[PDB]
Design an enzyme around this catalytic site. Structure first.
Site, PDB file in Angstrom:
ATOM      1  N   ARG A 129      21.765  35.531  -1.011  1.00 20.48           N
ATOM      2  CA  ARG A 129      20.407  35.548  -0.480  1.00 20.48           C
ATOM      3  C   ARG A 129      19.363  35.275  -1.558  1.00 20.48           C
ATOM      4  O   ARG A 129      19.480  35.735  -2.696  1.00 20.48           O
ATOM      5  CB  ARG A 129      20.115  36.892   0.184  1.00 20.48           C
ATOM      6  CG  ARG A 129      21.064  37.249   1.310  1.00 20.48           C
ATOM      7  CD  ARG A 129      20.676  38.576   1.935  1.00 20.48           C
ATOM      8  NE  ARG A 129      21.585  38.961   3.006  1.00 20.48           N
ATOM      9  CZ  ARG A 129      22.697  39.660   2.816  1.00 20.48           C
ATOM     10  NH1 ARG A 129      23.033  40.054   1.598  1.00 20.48           N
ATOM     11  NH2 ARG A 129      23.472  39.971   3.843  1.00 20.48           N
ATOM     12  N   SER A 151      18.904  48.778   8.539  1.00 23.35           N
ATOM     13  CA  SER A 151      17.922  47.863   7.965  1.00 23.35           C
ATOM     14  C   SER A 151      17.988  48.010   6.451  1.00 23.35           C
ATOM     15  O   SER A 151      17.672  49.078   5.914  1.00 23.35           O
ATOM     16  CB  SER A 151      16.519  48.154   8.491  1.00 23.35           C
ATOM     17  OG  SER A 151      15.557  47.341   7.844  1.00 23.35           O
ATOM     18  N   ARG A 152      18.401  46.951   5.758  1.00 23.16           N
ATOM     19  CA  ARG A 152      18.570  47.052   4.315  1.00 23.16           C
ATOM     20  C   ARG A 152      17.256  46.903   3.564  1.00 23.16           C
ATOM     21  O   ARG A 152      17.179  47.282   2.390  1.00 23.16           O
ATOM     22  CB  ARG A 152      19.572  46.004   3.839  1.00 23.16           C
ATOM     23  CG  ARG A 152      20.970  46.273   4.351  1.00 23.16           C
ATOM     24  CD  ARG A 152      21.947  45.202   3.935  1.00 23.16           C
ATOM     25  NE  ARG A 152      23.228  45.373   4.612  1.00 23.16           N
ATOM     26  CZ  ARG A 152      23.899  44.389   5.197  1.00 23.16           C
ATOM     27  NH1 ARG A 152      23.413  43.156   5.190  1.00 23.16           N
ATOM     28  NH2 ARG A 152      25.058  44.637   5.791  1.00 23.16           N
ATOM     29  N   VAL A 153      16.224  46.367   4.213  1.00 19.75           N
ATOM     30  CA  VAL A 153      14.872  46.480   3.682  1.00 19.75           C
ATOM     31  C   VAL A 153      14.404  47.926   3.763  1.00 19.75           C
ATOM     32  O   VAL A 153      13.952  48.513   2.774  1.00 19.75           O
ATOM     33  CB  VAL A 153      13.922  45.536   4.438  1.00 19.75           C
ATOM     34  CG1 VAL A 153      12.481  45.832   4.069  1.00 19.75           C
ATOM     35  CG2 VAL A 153      14.281  44.094   4.139  1.00 19.75           C
ATOM     36  N   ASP A 195      19.592  40.607   6.936  1.00 16.69           N
ATOM     37  CA  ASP A 195      19.347  41.816   6.157  1.00 16.69           C
ATOM     38  C   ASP A 195      19.501  43.082   6.989  1.00 16.69           C
ATOM     39  O   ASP A 195      18.944  44.124   6.634  1.00 16.69           O
ATOM     40  CB  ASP A 195      17.943  41.780   5.549  1.00 16.69           C
ATOM     41  CG  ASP A 195      17.508  40.386   5.164  1.00 16.69           C
ATOM     42  OD1 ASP A 195      16.659  39.815   5.883  1.00 16.69           O
ATOM     43  OD2 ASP A 195      17.999  39.866   4.140  1.00 16.69           O
TER      44      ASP A 195
END
Ligand SMILES: Nc1ncnc2c1ncn2[C@@H]1O[C@H](COP(=O)(O)OP(=O)(O)OP(=O)(O)O)[C@@H](O)[C@H]1O
Ligand SMILES: Nc1ncnc2c1ncn2[C@@H]1O[C@H](COP(=O)(O)OP(=O)(O)O)[C@@H](O)[C@H]1O
Ligand SMILES: Nc1ncnc2c1ncn2[C@@H]1O[C@H](COP(=O)(O)OP(=O)(O)O)[C@@H](O)[C@H]1O
Ligand SMILES: [Mg+2]
Ligand SMILES: [Mg+2]
Lengths: 173, 512, 49, 460, 49, 343, 73, 146, 118
Positions: free
Chosen positions: F183, B374-376, B349
């Protein structure tokens, strides 16, 4: 090694022997062929690139004690494929298959000395309860066991040898 | 030790507790030995993935159940094995010990302690090759993991249950950044795991000395498969580490795991695959090398309170469990688009891309903005850090492109002259020393100083001494605020005014 | 500490030479169901040191 | 008594059949009479029932099926200790210098386990080479590993000769040289350079030459490692010279292709990284002694990206980068000061003075590399008066870190010089600060300590 | 330093214990080999069967 | 009554032996008791002598040789119809949500032939999606294929949700979302975002994610498609979303390697352009209904010549590109109108 | 050592009488099926390029006349 | 390798022992000039890699030079001899170092040549000197020079 | 063979071969079926011997001379494909055509930087 090439031929030979009620004769016939396969001069001939047909005829000739159904067909089919060196295994596989259908097990026992024939009969009846077959014990006198017995029933083994207990204790330490 | 009665009583207890009876077991013969693979004849009841016990208290893993033989890989030194030796089938699919009791100890892939300090005290065993929580059993990642590095914690926030790829060329601070994250986890609820794959033993010795020196070792499990150990141990290690971490995840606790050189795991799996004659793929790596890394990294997850409640049979109610993975990948000359790198980048991610030409220029840690994300993202970040850090990443990327332009343009506009100074100061500020983790309040006030212009006079130089003096001043006077910031992470106009007052008092009254 | 533990082991080894006589009989008598033969000691002392 | 019989010969690969009870284990040495010569075989694989697959250590010509094979129940095992010093041996530990038998006392098998991470000794004692540029720009500690990367013709072999001499008649410690994939001309030149320079008595030489079967070339690194491990056990701080790792990986590729293993990324063997680890993990310092090591690494076609140099980088602690451009300029040793690096180059282990001197040298040379094109287009008289000084000081630094080697004398006739680290730091720290702005540039070329620079300028 | 001395104490205690284990189990082996009878062997077999 | 015996287990490939006359057909489903859990095997090849080579729709660990195998006389069958709306299922048609059970009236095999030539609709029509950029610059043919090429953050999920909404409210169709090889985090958050928008009542979800054995990631797309086909037969217009078709190609490559077939142009399986056409040919308009498809596409190494993009683009009718620049301008949807394309 | 599409009950048929060519040369039996390629046993009369008729109404094209079997698509 | 390692210079004692007297003081020699063909100048091939690893040096002949007229088209600086001056008369060894340095400087300053009249005269004198050396090496076939 | 017969009569002969590459290609097509392991790019192991056994007997002798022109197709315009590369050694004058020059329309599209003669 050629277990895998011998499996089909053994299965075919056995499955044919029960259609014609002659398993017992086929076994001795295959045992005869398996012995001819071992000779030093015949093993030189089988390695030689003769035509499968004439090499099969050169193999039929040394064994006249053979059915039309058994030698003159099985040996020729195995020669066409060049499988004749597999005969010693086609035998063993055949035996095994038989022991399967006849619900039998060739349990082996190993001991430092002879058993009392009460011990051994108890072993027979107890293995016949552990398994679900008529067992056929054969003993071996191996001195390294020193005391107790090893019971081998195929891939299952029960070790009661004092040497096994000693080395296990050696590894508990 | 003069009390030899202690030795005699040990041996007497071993002799007394020795069990004399014997039991049936299923047995086979080794038919072939080569390059670490053995063929076994027999074991009709062997099952795929089972552990087979060899003479010498070591194991092989049955990978191929062929029609008349079992192809297994030895876990350890194979060379003393020979045709004719006999092996026994254990009833166990590949296990490892798990639990609090091995927390703070060094072990190998099989969970045997290589630490010398005696045996483990686990609770039960876990299957190595397990299955991840399903789509409905997970939860969103919205809790921070602090790595203690200003660059990462501001630009690239990591959340509990995130998977962040540490990717970069050789010798660019990947291992340092990972072990500093572990050391920061000391005094947090997060339990740490470090799985070293293919590392030379001197690296592991140094890692353990630094973990115990900075007191982080009592928190963390170290799983070792050194560069000289059999490829089977290197291939199957990360799954052992993942199971030890998933023990904590399934109990509603937080864990963090670092897989050092997944690229070396992929090389060890390629070796073990080619030695079994399995068909090759794009770069000789087997076909399922993606399904090697995927089914490992998908276990790193945050699981919702209903999942942990049902798994633990009602013994825990409010907790949500998480496992955070930081895989490390080594690129060659920075070609991100290689095979295994672009797979792992398609799995994770985000990525912390470490640039080698920044690292050699003394910019340590050499995180490269722009290409790293950071895709979060800010959902994991704490509010004060989210407020202060919003600009820093784009400001740095545009500073870098502008400073690339600058070399060809002397005598340049005085408006960009200020962006190109402020970027050069922020890029100078974000580097820090090897083993110095920094708390959220320390990073926050340093970033507030950088963003609200308090550098522009000190912009000269000695900004490192300025940063150290600022931290020591704030630690002397305003500790009740550092406490509030560390406990709440909250941000208010009142806290904004307090921080203004701190920097005003620092600039007027102190030196650097 | 090295010199201390070295002499501590040297002292232990002599007493363990006594203890091993007992422990070899213990290890034999533990694994056969009728206990081992008395006054067979000459072969054990031939093993002992 | 001999109990095996040969059943195949295909090139260097021989198959031997034994009775089912007595099958040799892996890496056992078998022995057979190849006519009047005695040939040993190393068991690679136990394939099938009673058959054994092996690599011939000597040449395989003249073998025939049905020969008797005696199995020596030990791996290949070699003589070790003082007795080896100043002898030349092959992979089997047989002499090739014709000085008669080795006269051994003990033999060790070449295959053994590496030290565990608990036995390692964390150490930071820097070695002091006689070479200015290596001492300054790439320091390395005992037990560390050094890789001399470069193309062909750049000076790896002569740099290793210089290191052997300097660490054999300045610091009097022993040394071992494992020439895997050696060129016989270069091996004879090495033998005569060491015998002429009186250092032969502190070097133990093992040669696996290029005209020998692949596994014979492969095992030699393990033979030299086994001698260095014997010397380590005695408490020495040994130094192990591996003449080319690239040819070790090539020998591994060849052996793996002969055995018919499925090849890998670039045709390399699958076990590439495990062979490299089994080699490089035995080379470590321990609580009793240490093995330091320097390894020459040839980079094929000038890329650090293919599996061999790419896989050896993971183990080195210091990397020296040699360039043929600098050598063609006429500066030796041809070390590129900007691209060579070390893990041990930080203030905490080398001290702030050394670190600052090194970083200043690199900064000066980088600034000169920047100014070079402005000089080329505009001409020097346009540079600012502080840049016209950076230029001269960088040009003098660039001269001063060349050096005459004792072994290069046969190439140049001039005598060699050994420079202590203190003199190196003093010289560079003086040059950067302008203490020698009055000397010509050629006063620094091919000199030892700065005293020779001032004395040459006084003569010049 | 004390933790390292404790590690060496463990190593020496384990090495001594291993040597006495090896000697004691070889002694028990020779004791059982000499000290046997058919009534004990039958009794062992009768416990096995 | 079980009749077969497991004879080999090598990774995810399982060989089972049957009587010479009872040999299963090619795509039949067998099952085994792997401990307590039942395991389904999909046949792939018939070898000589009654041996059959299959791939496990599950974890292969724990399988002995000689286990009894039961031959189901039909391919994998999944529930279909209204009952599947708002649920989540795996390849085998089993609920992987926890809402209980699917009260389906009917079950369909996932394998079947594409519509016949005389069965295709003798007409060509547009699909009014209701979005200005798409309707203007890249119209949708009713029954066409559409590629989505954007990255992440560009709002792809909101585009898919808006399409799911509009095809249901303004038109009167349903939608199927097949997430293949992606995912688990994104499927979980996508489920939550669809239930927080009242569109979950109108879409049926099927998932085979990255943590799944190869066979699941292979056959999940056919499960989704055969549900879309059951919606089609009812006379409706259906939308089928494939969350990454490149992963369908890549799982076919993995299974091909496991079966031991020779590698094709770039290592891809030799059956690539067939395996792709067997899927994409079922997505057509028919003179009873129609299935339109929106497929997220991924181009390896940004190479539009690689066999996987080259094979996929043969089938796509329209192509929508999503760009981050348009989003930085605060324009949503972030469709790039210059590169977006439709034939 | 590998098998060559000789299997238990075909070997049994050859065991019954070696010269099974006493049966029709006009027909045979499918022995394997993989990805549209088919292996057939018998068909001594087959000629390369011939249309082979399968159950249902389908055809296969005989590509290979090997020692003992016909390979077709 | 076992072909090429047979080319060797052999000391006087080996010759005197092999011939069992009848020759003394003299050294034997065999010199090998293997030829290899590369496909489009790639050295990363298999057989070129092996032979480049075995031998003592390489003469790289390039088609871009041969077409321009530099014949023989030896590419200096990419071509190596590991024997060096030890195999030269002392007059040649003396005179060759300035040729090597002149061509090394020419190769470094080669890039600017496409913009020659942007350059300074000091570098210009090196650039046009390196051209004159390159022009001087050109030589007609079958005309060996003493 | 017919060219060789006219050569042995003492004449001098012209031989035109309109695509020699097809000889080697037909050998590649057959090669796999003959049970020979494939080589570098698929070609038969015997590519260079199959080519040299034909090429060496098309030569002038002291009794007669054969002048010959061969067209030599190069697959995928790759001059380094094994078949062109192994053909180049046999000829005395090689004229190399190129597609780039033909795309200009400059026929004859000879590349003068690659064509040569003995
Ligand atoms: N922030 C830092 N400040 C100073 N030195 C650092 C820093 N980070 C790393 N280093 C130093 O840089 C070197 C390389 O660091 P590290 O070992 O983490 O790199 P790596 O990429 O993990 O190595 P490899 O890729 O070879 O495994 C070490 O000597 C380390 O001490
Ligand atoms: N310091 C030096 N002085 C003189 N000549 C040198 C020096 N270093 C290298 N050379 C020259 O380089 C040649 C080969 O160097 P070598 O060490 O064999 O390079 P490689 O690393 O390719 O083995 C030698 O013949 C020698 O003439
Ligand atoms: N139609 C729209 N109107 C307003 N904002 C939008 C629209 N589409 C996307 N966005 C914004 O873009 C963001 C992209 O996030 P997300 O949809 O999660 O990206 P992805 O789905 O590609 O991961 C949304 O959260 C939202 O803030
Ligand atoms: Mg590292
Ligand atoms: Mg060299």
């Amino acid at each position: 090694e050629f277990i895998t090439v011998a499996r089909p031929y053994a299965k075919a030979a056995f499955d044919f022997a029960v259609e014609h009620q002659s398993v017992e004769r086929w076994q001795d016939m295959l045992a005869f062929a398996a012995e001819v396969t071992k000779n030093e001069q015949m093993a030189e001939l089988l390695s030689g690139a003769l035509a499968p047909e004439t090499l099969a005829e050169s193999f039929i000739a040394v064994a006249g004690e053979q059915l039309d159904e058994n030698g003159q067909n099985l040996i020729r089919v195995m020669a066409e494929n060049g499988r004749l060196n597999a005969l010693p295994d086609v035998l063993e596989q055949f035996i095994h298959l038989r022991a399967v259908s006849e619900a039998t097990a060739e349990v082996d026992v190993i001991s430092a000395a002879a058993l009392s024939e009460q011990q051994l009969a108890k072993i027979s009846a107890a293995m016949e309860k552990r398994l679900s077959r008529k067992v056929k014990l054969n003993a071996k006198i191996d001195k390294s066991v020193m005391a107790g017995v090893i019971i081998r029933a195929g891939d299952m083994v029960i070790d009661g040898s004092v040497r096994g207990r000693l080395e296990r204790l050696a590894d508990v330490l | 030790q003069l009390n030899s009665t202690e030795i005699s009583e040990l041996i007497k207890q071993r002799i007394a507790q020795f069990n004399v009876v014997s039991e049936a077991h299923n047995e086979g013969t080794i038919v072939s030995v080569s390059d670490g693979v053995i063929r076994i004849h027999g074991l009709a009841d062997a099952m795929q993935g089972e552990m087979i016990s060899l003479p010498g208290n070591r194991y092989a893993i049955a990978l191929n159940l062929e029609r008349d033989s079992v192809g297994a890989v030895v876990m350890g030194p194979y060379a003393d094995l020979a045709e004719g030796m006999k092996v026994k089938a254990t009833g166990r699919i590949l296990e490892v010990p798990v639990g609090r009791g091995l927390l703070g100890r060094v072990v190998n892939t099989l969970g045997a302690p290589i630490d010398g300090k005696g045996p483990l005290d686990h609770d039960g065993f876990s299957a190595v090759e397990a299955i991840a929580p399903g789509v409905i059993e997970r939860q969103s990642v919205d809790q921070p993991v602090q790595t203690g590095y200003k660059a990462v914690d501001s630009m690239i926030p990591i959340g509990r249950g995130q998977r962040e790829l540490i990717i970069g060329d050789r010798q660019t601070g990947k291992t340092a950044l990972a072990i500093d994250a572990i050391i920061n986890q000391r005094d947090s609820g997060i339990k740490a795991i470090y799985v070293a794959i293919g590392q030379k033993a001197s690296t592991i010795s140094n890692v353990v000395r630094k973990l115990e020196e900075h007191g982080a070792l009592a928190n963390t499990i170290v799983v070792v498969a050194t560069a000289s150990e059999s490829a089977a141990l290197q291939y199957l290690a990360p799954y052992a580490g993942a199971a030890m971490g998933e023990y904590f995840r399934d109990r509603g606790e937080d864990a963090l795991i670092i897989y050092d050189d997944l690229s070396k795991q992929a090389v060890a799996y390629r070796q073990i695959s080619l030695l079994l004659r399995r068909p090759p793929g794009r770069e000789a790596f087997p076909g399922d090398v993606f399904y090697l890394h995927s089914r490992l990294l998908e276990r790193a997850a945050r699981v919702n309170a209903e999942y942990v409640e049902a798994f633990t049979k009602g013994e825990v109610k409010g907790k949500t469990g998480s496992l955070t993975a930081l895989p490390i990948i080594e690129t060659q000359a920075g070609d991100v688009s290689a095979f295994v790198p672009t797979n792992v980048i398609s799995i994770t991610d985000g990525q912390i891309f470490l640039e080698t030409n920044l690292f050699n220029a003394g910019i340590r840690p050499a995180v490269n903005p722009g290409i790293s994300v950071s895709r979060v993202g800010g959902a994991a970040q704490t509010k004060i850090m989210k407020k202060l850090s919003g600009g820093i990443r784009t400001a740095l990327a545009q500073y870098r492109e502008l400073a690339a332009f600058s070399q060809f343009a002397s005598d340049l506009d005085d408006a960009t002259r200020k962006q190109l100074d402020h970027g050069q100061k922020v890029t100078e500020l974000l580097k820090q020393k090897q083993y110095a983790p920094m708390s959220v309040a320390q990073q926050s006030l340093v970033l507030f100083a950088a963003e609200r212009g308090y550098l522009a006079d000190v912009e000269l130089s000695k900004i490192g001494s300025f940063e150290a003096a600022l931290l020591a001043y704030v630690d002397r006077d305003h500790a009740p605020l550092m406490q509030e910031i560390n406990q709440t992470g909250g941000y208010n106009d009142e806290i904004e005014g307090k921080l203004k007052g701190i920097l005003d008092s620092f600039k007027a009254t102190q030196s650097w | 500490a090295q010199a201390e533990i070295e002499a501590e082991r040297k002292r232990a080894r002599e007493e363990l030479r006594k203890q091993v006589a007992i422990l070899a009989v213990a290890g034999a008598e533990k694994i056969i169901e009728r206990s081992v033969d008395e006054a067979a000691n000459s072969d054990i002392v031939d093993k002992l040191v | 008594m001999a109990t095996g019989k040969i059943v195949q010969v295909i090139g260097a690969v021989v198959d031997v059949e034994f009775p089912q009870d007595a099958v040799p284990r892996v890496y056992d040495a078998l022995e057979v009479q190849n006519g009047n010569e005695r040939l040993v075989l190393e068991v690679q694989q136990q394939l099938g029932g009673g058959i054994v697959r092996t690599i011939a250590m000597g040449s395989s010509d003249g073998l025939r099926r049905g020969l008797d094979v005696k199995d020596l129940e030990h791996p290949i095992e070699v003589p070790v200790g003082k007795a080896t010093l100043g002898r030349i041996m092959n992979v089997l530990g047989e002499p090739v210098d014709m000085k008669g038998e080795i006269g051994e006392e003990e033999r060790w098998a070449i295959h053994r386990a590496a030290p565990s991470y608990e036995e390692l000794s964390n150490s930071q004692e820097l070695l002091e080479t006689g070479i200015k540029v290596i001492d300054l720009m790439a320091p390395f500690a005992k037990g560390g590993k050094v890789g001399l990367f470069g193309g062909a013709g750049v000076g790896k072999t002569v740099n290793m000769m210089e290191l052997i001499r300097n660490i054999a008649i300045e610091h009097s410690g022993y040394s071992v040289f494992a020439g895997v994939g050696e060129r016989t001309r270069e091996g004879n030149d090495f033998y005569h350079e060491m015998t002429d320079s009186n250092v032969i008595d502190k070097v133990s030489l093992v040669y696996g030459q290029m005209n020998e079967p692949p596994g014979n070339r492969l095992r030699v690194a393990l033979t030299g490692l086994t001698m260095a491990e014997k010397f380590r056990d005695e408490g020495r701080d040994v130094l192990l010279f591996v003449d080319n790792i690239y040819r070790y990986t090539l020998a591994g590729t060849e052996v793996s292709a002969l055995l018919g293993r499925m090849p890998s990324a670039v045709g390399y063997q699958p076990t590439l990284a495990e062979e490299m680890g089994v080699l490089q993990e035995r080379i470590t310092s321990t609580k009793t002694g240490s093995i330091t090591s320097v390894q020459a690494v040839y980079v094929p076609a000038d890329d650090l990206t293919d599996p061999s140099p790419a896989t050896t980088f993971a183990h080195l602690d210091a990397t020296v980068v040699l360039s043929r451009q600098i050598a063609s300029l006429g500066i030796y040793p041809a070390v590129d000061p900007l691209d060579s690096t070390s893990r041990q180059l930080d203030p905490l282990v080398v001290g702030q003075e050394h670190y600052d001197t090194a970083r200043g040298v690199q900064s000066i040379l980088q600034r000169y590399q920047e100014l070079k094109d402005i000089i080329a287009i505009l001409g020097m008289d346009e540079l600012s008066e502080e840049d016209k000084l950076v230029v001269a000081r960088a040009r003098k630094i660039q001269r001063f870190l060349s050096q005459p080697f004792f072994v290069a004398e046969v190439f140049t006739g001039s005598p060699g010089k050994y420079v202590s680290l203190k003199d190196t730091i003093r010289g560079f720290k003086g040059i950067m600060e302008g203490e020698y702005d009055h000397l010509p540039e050629q006063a620094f070329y091919m000199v030892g300590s700065i005293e020779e620079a001032v004395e040459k300028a006084k003569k010049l």
